[PDB]
């Protein structure tokens, strides 16, 4: 994750593997 330029919904899908714990609010649209 940290300081690398991985882009589009593969970082939305990886956000559930990276932030991980809570199950999240995530409001800035959803990143298509």
């Amino acid at each position: 994750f940290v300081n690398q330029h991985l882009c589009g919904s593969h970082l939305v899908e990886a956000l559930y593997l990276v932030c991980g714990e809570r199950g999240f609010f995530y409001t800035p649209k959803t990143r298509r």
């Binding site: 999240f24 409001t27 800035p28 990143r31």
Partner: peptide, 21 residues
């Protein structure tokens, strides 16, 4: 938003906590 910021520039866990509530 966080992934737009990661596509253009540097990206940190502080920008995760900005939207990962």
């Amino acid at each position: 938003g966080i992934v737009e910021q990661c596509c253009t520039s540097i990206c940190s866990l502080y920008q995760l906590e900005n939207y990962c509530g």
